[PDB]
Amino acid sequence: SMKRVQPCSLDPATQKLITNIFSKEMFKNTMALMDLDVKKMPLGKLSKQQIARGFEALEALEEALKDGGQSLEELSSHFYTVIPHNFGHSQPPPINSPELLQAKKDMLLVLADIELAQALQAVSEQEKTVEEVPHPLDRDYQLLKCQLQLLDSGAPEYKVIQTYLEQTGSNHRCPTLQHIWKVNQEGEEDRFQAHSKLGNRKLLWHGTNMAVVAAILTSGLRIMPHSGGRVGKGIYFASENSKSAGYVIGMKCGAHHVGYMFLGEVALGREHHINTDNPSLKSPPPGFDSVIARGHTEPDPTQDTELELDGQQVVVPQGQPVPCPEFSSSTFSQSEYLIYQESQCRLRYLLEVH
Numbered sequence: 001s002m003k004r005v006q007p008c009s010l011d012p013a014t015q016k017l018i019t020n021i022f023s024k025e026m027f028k029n030t031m032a033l034m035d036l037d038v039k040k041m042p043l044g045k046l047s048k049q050q051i052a053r054g055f056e057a058l059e060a061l062e063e064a065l066k067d068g069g070q071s072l073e074e075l076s077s078h079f080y081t082v083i084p085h086n087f088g089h090s091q092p093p094p095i096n097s098p099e100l101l102q103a104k105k106d107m108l109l110v111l112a113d114i115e116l117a118q119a120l121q122a123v124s125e126q127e128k129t130v131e132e133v134p135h136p137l138d139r140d141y142q143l144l145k146c147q148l149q150l151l152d153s154g155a156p157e158y159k160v161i162q163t164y165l166e167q168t169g170s171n172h173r174c175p176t177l178q179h180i181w182k183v184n185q186e187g188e189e190d191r192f193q194a195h196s197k198l199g200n201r202k203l204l205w206h207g208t209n210m211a212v213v214a215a216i217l218t219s220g221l222r223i224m225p226h227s228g229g230r231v232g233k234g235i236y237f238a239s240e241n242s243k244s245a246g247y248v249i250g251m252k253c254g255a256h257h258v259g260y261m262f263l264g265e266v267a268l269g270r271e272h273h274i275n276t277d278n279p280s281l282k283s284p285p286p287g288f289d290s291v292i293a294r295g296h297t298e299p300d301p302t303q304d305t306e307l308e309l310d311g312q313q314v315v316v317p318q319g320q321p322v323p324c325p326e327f328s329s330s331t332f333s334q335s336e337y338l339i340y341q342e343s344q345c346r347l348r349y350l351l352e353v354h
């Protein structure tokens with residue numbers, strides 16, 4: 001007979017976050033923004049197998065791009081059969097450049113995290129048998145297996161975070177800070193403790209699609225087989241909020257535009273600095289723990305402060321960006337900070353920005 005729904009334990013801010021990051025509208029919006037045909041690929045129909053077939057088709061395309069084999073056209077057509085796209089019921093375009101191939105890999109990585117959020121929400125048999133259920137938002141929070149604590153104005157780190165955001169965000173249209181949560185994804189702790197000898201820790205921005213926030217809270221920042229970009233197959237961070245905010249896909253809610261950004265503690269250790277793009281990188285050179293694509297600018301190092309997190313000092317930039325004359329000819333306007341092991345980052349904060 002009828003189960004009791006227990007009252008929600010969550011504060012309003014956290015309720016809104018959990019509503020947003022599991023929202024079916026949000027997920028379908030994201031799919032439409034990536035040109036996917038949501039009518040032929042509904043959320044409940046997404047499968048790991050379908051996604052795996054999509055990567056196989058792109059793998060075949062990539063081989064063709066590097067025979068008497070199938071044309072890029074034919075191979076593209078196969079991809080589009082496996083992963084339905086919407087282009088106003090015109091033909092979808094051929095995947096015939098490295099840039100576009102990577103764009104499709106990135107779409108599929110986002111889609112794989114949407115599928116993860118759907119799988120996560122599957123109702124277990126224990127939940128079918130208990131006579132009282134948590135409020136749906138408590139249930140969704142619990143699935144993350146990630147502790148979130150909303151911070152108020154006088155948490156020790158609050159002003160330091162706000163200063164990082166303000167001093168390194170866009171000069172004309174800085175994102176407006178609404179909330180900060182401390183993030184404790186346990187199961188990150190053990191692997192991150194591995195690098196406690198490794199110095200040079202920095203708190204760095206990671207901006208993303210709203211649609212991958214649940215996945216990240218569940219599994220941490222990840223390097224996937226088809227990950228790539230201007231500095232290769234790693235996890236990308238920025239020291240300038242404005243660089244990371246470029247990757248934030250927010251969603252219109254009422255009269256404003258809501259977005260989420262992370263701050264991670266990154267054990268950078270011995271840095272290798274580059275000044276030109278290298279998409280082929282899969283690790284730092286021998287003897288180095290990270291790769292920094294150095295920008296024309298950097299938050300003024302003289303203003304760096306520190307936080308203490310789990311008894312370690314973590315550098316937090318507090319300065320506006322200034323020119324770095326040694327990197328004035330860099331192919332990078334702003335720095336990209338790369339690690340190539342998922343263990344070298346721990347999620348620390350999540351921010352809601354408008």
Ligand SMILES: CC[C@H](NC(=O)CCc1nc2ccccc2c(=O)[nH]1)c1ccccc1
Nearest residue numbers: 106109110206207208236237238244247336
């Ligand atoms: C679009 C694919 C997506 N990656 C991201 O959301 C990271 C985006 C991002 N890139 C950066 C690049 C340089 C500097 C900073 C950033 C950043 O803050 N976010 C992704 C989603 C799921 C699984 C792996 C990767």
